[PDB]
Amino acid sequence: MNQQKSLTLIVALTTSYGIGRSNSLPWKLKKEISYFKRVTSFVPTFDSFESMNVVLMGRKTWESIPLQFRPLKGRINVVITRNESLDLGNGIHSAKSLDHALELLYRTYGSESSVQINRIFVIGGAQLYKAAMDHPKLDRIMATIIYKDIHCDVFFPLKFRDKEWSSVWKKEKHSDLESWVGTKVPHGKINEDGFDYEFEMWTRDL
Ligand SMILES: NC(=O)C1=CN([C@@H]2O[C@H](COP(=O)(O)OP(=O)(O)OC[C@H]3O[C@@H](n4cnc5c(N)ncnc54)[C@@H](OP(=O)(O)O)[C@@H]3O)[C@@H](O)[C@H]2O)C=CC1
Ligand SMILES: CCOC(=O)CCCOc1ccc(OC)c(Cc2cnc3nc(N)nc(N)c3c2C)c1
């Protein structure tokens, strides 16, 4: 009664797997953020009469997001921390692990509940990505690849794009990405603020 849905990890990362610096993002990309918001918010039309997606994040990511933007609108937010607590929150879910979060969500958002869960996303940071990478239900990574070795002080924990991991993690066709996300997605390099980046989707068999 706990393992009824796959997890999807969503991340923007450099070719050196860098994801962060000074507890924030070391880039400023409005369209990249708009993609994150669209992907994490998208529910197919028939289902969206009551469906909401879930965003799971570590406490340091929670704090990283400008207070203006919290909780992340229109999604069920859960902050994962070893130390309960709160973080001061208006409706704001807390759990001590990825599986305690899932248990809390299934208990809270049941068959009878007016709000139902569509997809569940792990949205960072490195420590929670590490847990998700070890979780037997994670099967999908929505990666934005940033083609610049921007200096970072926190890194994605497993080199899923590299040869050593290439029998396990496979990059999907762009048409498959678009299908999964429910919309046209720009394909190939996008330039904002002096860097090229591009959207990818990678999967692992369960
Ligand atoms: N580029 C990208 O897409 C993203 C980048 N980032 C960046 O990542 C950096 C944050 O990464 P990181 O420092 O690893 O922080 P995280 O957000 O993963 O938070 C780490 C903390 O969250 C809790 N936590 C995480 N995993 C677990 C677990 N398995 N069980 C229990 N508690 C857990 C904290 O708990 P406790 O309260 O016990 O200390 C732990 O210290 C920042 O620079 C942020 O900007 C974040 C999201 C996306
Ligand atoms: C009205 C604007 O819509 C908004 O709500 C975004 C405003 C917040 O600005 C941010 C500053 C820092 C930050 O690091 C946590 C994030 C989170 C983020 C950004 N890109 C991201 N991009 C990807 N591919 N993946 C992520 N997981 C991600 C994540 C978590 C956002």
Side-chain angles (χ1 to χ4, degrees), residues 76-94:
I76 297 149
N77 294 220
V78 184
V79 180
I80 310 317
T81 158
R82 213 88 78 166
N83 185 169
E84 81 177 50
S85 66
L86 299 188
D87 320 291
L88 267 245
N90 312 250
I92 150 199
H93 307 300
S94 191

Side-chain angles (χ1 to χ4, degrees), residues 2-13:
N2 202 263
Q3 297 302 15
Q4 25 264 176
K5 270 173 190 296
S6 295
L7 310 176
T8 298
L9 182 147
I10 183 161
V11 66
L13 80 177

Side-chain angles (χ1 to χ4, degrees), residues 10-13 23-25 27 29 32-37 40 60-62 64-66 69-70 72-73 75 122-124 129 142-144 199:
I10 183 161
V11 66
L13 80 177
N23 219 240
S24 80
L25 305 171
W27 45 74
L29 315 159
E32 207 294 318
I33 290 179
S34 180
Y35 177 84
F36 166 81
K37 182 182 168 207
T40 62
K60 302 169 206 191
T61 300
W62 169 254
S64 178
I65 299 181
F69 292 118
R70 290 190 254 146
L72 295 170
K73 275 162 194 172
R75 286 147 285 190
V122 170
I123 61 156
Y129 285 146
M142 305 305 292
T144 302
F199 302 117

Side-chain angles (χ1 to χ4, degrees), residues 50-114:
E50 35 177 353
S51 298
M52 276 196 84
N53 300 323
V54 166
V55 292
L56 302 182
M57 71 191 92
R59 200 246 316 150
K60 302 169 206 191
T61 300
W62 169 254
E63 290 177 2
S64 178
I65 299 181
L67 207 213
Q68 157 166 25
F69 292 118
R70 290 190 254 146
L72 295 170
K73 275 162 194 172
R75 286 147 285 190
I76 297 149
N77 294 220
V78 184
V79 180
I80 310 317
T81 158
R82 213 88 78 166
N83 185 169
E84 81 177 50
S85 66
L86 299 188
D87 320 291
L88 267 245
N90 312 250
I92 150 199
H93 307 300
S94 191
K96 51 188 147 137
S97 82
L98 214 45
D99 287 299
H100 292 262
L102 295 170
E103 189 282 330
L104 172 62
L105 290 158
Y106 294 131
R107 176 163 92 246
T108 313
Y109 301 98
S111 63
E112 68 140 67
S113 174
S114 210

Side-chain angles (χ1 to χ4, degrees), residues 114-175:
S114 210
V115 181
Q116 295 281 305
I117 289 155
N118 179 227
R119 280 170 175 175
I120 306 175
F121 290 96
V122 170
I123 61 156
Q127 280 185 31
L128 212 217
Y129 285 146
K130 186 198 174 302
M133 286 307 287
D134 291 348
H135 190 103
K137 298 263 101 187
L138 171 78
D139 65 350
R140 185 181 308 274
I141 290 170
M142 305 305 292
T144 302
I145 182 73
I146 285 165
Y147 292 106
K148 172 149 185 61
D149 179 15
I150 295 169
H151 176 266
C152 285
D153 62 14
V154 165
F155 288 86
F156 194 85
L158 183 150
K159 300 187 190 65
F160 60 94
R161 306 176 71 263
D162 286 17
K163 182 181 172 198
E164 59 177 345
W165 277 115
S166 60
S167 61
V168 167
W169 287 104
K170 306 291 193 184
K171 184 178 174 181
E172 301 283 356
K173 338 180 52 83
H174 188 76
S175 65

